[PDB]
Amino acid sequence: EISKQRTFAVILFLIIQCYKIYDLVILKSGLPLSGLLFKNYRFNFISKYFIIDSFFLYVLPSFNIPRLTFKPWVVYLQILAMLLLNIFISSDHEFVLISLIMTTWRKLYT
Secondary structure, eight states, rough: OOOHHHHHHHHHHHHHHHHHHHHHHHHTOOOOOOOOOSSSSHHHHHHHHHHHHHHHHTTTGGGGGOOOOSSSSSSSHHHHHHHHHHHHHHHHHHHHHHHHHHHHHHHHHH
């Protein structure tokens, strides 16, 4: 029943929060927990993008979209535009900036 499904989801959440309160009592008593997962930056990248790419590719069929038909003027283009324009501008600016607003100073000091 929908009543029992809701109750089971709330019980499973309460079990997770009870385990969190236990690990918190360990944390506040100064006892060793073991990080989050691992200290290898590469495994962190692989696991982070495994979750993100898998979630995107798993949910993408659920939209049932076969569907490349926008009304006259609709998205993605705007995001690309302003955003990258700004990016490039900033980059060039920064480059020139460093070039004549730092390097020169260093030379003078020397």
